[PDB]
């Protein structure tokens, strides 16, 4: 992913959601994918990656979201349209 263009990713929830964990939104630093559950929707789609920043969900800007705002958006969303962008340098503040 040399351009680091954001990607539009369509996921459909199963019985236990989209199948990833979010980290961040503690201090204006944005919302990142920390964990992708094996055999959940996000995993099986293949598109989302650890260290993706979540830029938007169903048209809502999460760039400046708090953890709690992002959780609310993501939890309340069926067919969910995510815009994600690979940001390994920013993610390195979370995990080396």
């Amino acid at each position: 992913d040399f351009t680091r263009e954001p990607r539009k990713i369509i996921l459909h929830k199963g019985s236990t959601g989209l199948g990833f964990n979010i980290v961040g939104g503690e201090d204006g630093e944005g919302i990142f994918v920390s964990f992708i559950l094996a055999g959940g929707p996000a995993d099986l789609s293949g598109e989302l990656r650890r260290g993706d920043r979540i830029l938007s969900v169903n048209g809502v800007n999460l760039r400046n979201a708090t953890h709690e705002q992002a959780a609310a958006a993501l939890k309340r969303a069926q067919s969910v349209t995510i815009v994600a962008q690979y940001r390994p340098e920013e993610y390195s503040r979370f995990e080396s």
Partner: peptide
């Protein structure tokens, strides 16, 4: 660090 399943 706290993380949240979605």
């Amino acid at each position: 660090x706290r993380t949240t399943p979605v």
